Design a protein around this ligand. Sequence first.
Ligand SMILES: [Cl-]
Ligand SMILES: [Cl-]
Length: 106
Amino acid sequence: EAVKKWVNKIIEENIIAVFAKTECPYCIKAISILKGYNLNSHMHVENIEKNPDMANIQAYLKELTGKSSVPRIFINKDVVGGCDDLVKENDEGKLKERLQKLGLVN
Ligand SMILES: [Cl-]
Ligand SMILES: [Cl-]
């Protein structure tokens, strides 16, 4: 229960929620893309490797999204997925439309 509540709070309190780990190039790329849309004020990045319950967090992220790998990316509680998913949404215009609907970009 405790791990799930903790993960939920991160996703609920932050419009943009990224679960990451230490020295993870696709985490860094995803976060940089997101920071490039000036989202920092509504972004939270959680390093789940520096955590005693990493495996439990990963298992719950898999229950929520289908994958246990990081990065895992949520926007307004909606599952974006990983960095590749973000790149697809970014290149095809879905990401900006997401952010426009949230008032995060003009
Ligand atoms: Cl996914
Ligand atoms: Cl994926």
